[model samples]
Target: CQLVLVESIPQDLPGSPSAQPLGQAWLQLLDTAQESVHVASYYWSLTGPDIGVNDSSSQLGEALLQKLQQLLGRNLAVATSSPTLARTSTDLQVLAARGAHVRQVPMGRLTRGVLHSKFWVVDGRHIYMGSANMDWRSLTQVKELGAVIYNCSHLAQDLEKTFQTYWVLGVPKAVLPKTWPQNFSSHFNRFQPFHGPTTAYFSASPPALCPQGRTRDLEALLAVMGSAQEFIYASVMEYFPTTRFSHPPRYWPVLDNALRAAAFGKGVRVRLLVGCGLNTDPTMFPYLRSLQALSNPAANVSVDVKVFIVPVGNHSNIPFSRVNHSKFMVTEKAAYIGTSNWSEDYFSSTAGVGLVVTTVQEQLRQLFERDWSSRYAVGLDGQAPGQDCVWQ
Candidate 1:
């Protein structure tokens, strides 16, 4: 199942010529890696003044970090986030001093989670999972999206078994002295599920590193919103349907009862596209006005929510931090690209990854119907008075 649809922009916002440009599709998927290459990120930087300033779109340039330093002459492997390798330690020690094996993961020794996933696994077969981050502010400020599978060798051998469990909990400590390579381990079933015509599955979250009774990522997102019958489109950065304060206080309502049983128990037709930057989440507009007060002003199941603001044009001296970092969920035949953030601390104690493509893809339904009718998405009509947000 071949697919491609990458994005990351905040300055020259225009899309849907079948979107690509996430640094020219991640340097043509690292120039089609030949044997192996796996990179999991939470952040990465390289491109002048170590990420300060803007030109040629803020970074990841230097010809795509010299084509990812020519894939370290071959079996390159990188995993990030021990505080992003202690804050980009000399640009990942210049790709581990040019041979690339560099692993880190240790978010306080996984006391439940960090090292949020963004993927890449070439030559294992091919994949480039979502929510961009190899920062250059996710290539110029924000508003990102992802997916670039090709060939899909059993979903890159089931994502090389979650990158061999974060390359063996990253270490002999702060990385280097490695192991999990040579024949790259796999017993599959760390929540695997990819069937054809685009039927798909791969969900991972803190189910304590999966496989003893699989299915995580909020139970594959409520089994794709309990097999939606009509419609349900979501593009979120965060949508809080109540439930906060962690540690047993983590309220999980199975994604607010699968969007209220897909709009009041199966009448379907729900749409949401949220993200209101400046580090959003002040209980996100009263939880989208209490899910638009669970609509039924006469019946015919419906729910609509929107707020995607990324606009301050010339970056207004670059302060408004562009956003709308997408996570997907489309239905009426299936789709679910993700990297987490539909809360409950990103589906039960952090760490995320998802991809459930049961066929539906007209380039991800025209990239969510071009951001649900662009102009930086707005609609939230529980009667609106003012809030326009113009800049582009």
Candidate 2:
């Protein structure tokens, strides 16, 4: 498994080290796929409408469209999500006109959930999953984290089955695919690890839609925390124990208790990297402060929470809108890459995916260390943001 980190800031910034731009990495991966390409993105956007295929105006978008066109020409089955379709209708229509399968997995179909997963499966063998959308801003503005896994066929097949669910969920119920049950039946209790001897597995959200016996994402996260013997590091857009209205809604303290147990009960260190940008939730700051306060009594256990504030970029004028949209966690024994936030709604009423790997990657550890010590990351001192602060 290869780790990909996209830094929206300049290389000269205070961050310890830089990473390859997401656009460059994504295009390079596209060039490597031979058999097929399946993309499930929340949204899509070109840099601008005036750019042509050869022009540099929409460099990333143009390159992406050209790659899809070439793959279609190769007679490969190229499929992609059409979330709401209206945002990039023309581009999607063009792809569909060129024989690429485009399916709209709108929220209304789920009845209580949204299609919020972002991932790509190449040739049903390689997988790229993360928080980055297909939008130009994700490439140029947002800081994202993702992984590129090679030769993990079992995990890839499981992800493909989830994609198949989205494909079937899009169309009319009267014409539902006859093979969905068998397709979703591709489940494995033991996944072949990409690098180590230990086993790895995949999990997803919204239990109503996933296979009956498949592991739920929330459960997987709790299991990791419960099993951790040393430390837990998490970076996410949002992490709160609060609950909101939902189908069969109860307080979603499962994750919160797991963290508490790891730190207070098991004497493990817990570090969190949460976004504190304009788009962050208002209640997050106070919740984090409370967690920090609760940790002060235990000398052996530490719960250090850091806020990652995205600075104004030299490229985009809308700096306040940009944020650290990464969602991941690294433990002493495992690493998790997820597409959902830590809130109850995201876990209970959203379509998302996660991968837990026992073969821990050193790159993930380095990533956490870099972000934790970055200049823009400020330590939470139990003092919440003032009332004058604005939250998007």
Candidate 2 accuracy as lDDT = 0.68
**Candidate 1 lDDT, tens digit per residue, 1-392?**
67766887667557364477687888888887776677878666655456445545654555677887777765465655544632623767777777777777765455445767778887888878888866666665777887777886876767657766666666655442234343443343324555655556666776665543345778877878788778888898777764555544544566877887789777887888887665675556766767877877468778877777765544554443577787888787778888877877666555677877763455677788888888767766522334334211
lDDT per residue as tens, model 2, 54-96? 3232455566667777777777544546344336336666777
Structural similarity to truth (TM-score) of each candidate: 0.35, 0.85
Which residue pairs in candidate 2 collide? none
Off by over 4 Å in 2: 1-21, 50-58, 80-89, 174-180, 190-198, 244-251, 313-316, 319-321, 381-392
Which residue window of length 10 is worst by lDDT in model 2?
Answer: 50-59
TM-score of 2: 0.85
- After the best TM-score superposition of candidate 1, give how far the Cα of residue 190 lies from its true spot, in angstroms: 18
Q: Model 2 misses residue 246 by how many Å? A: 4.7
List where candidate 1 sits over 4 angstroms from the true fold: 1-67, 70-120, 131-137, 145-153, 157-192, 195-199, 202-226, 229-233, 236-265, 274-294, 297-300, 311-327, 330-335, 338-354, 357-392
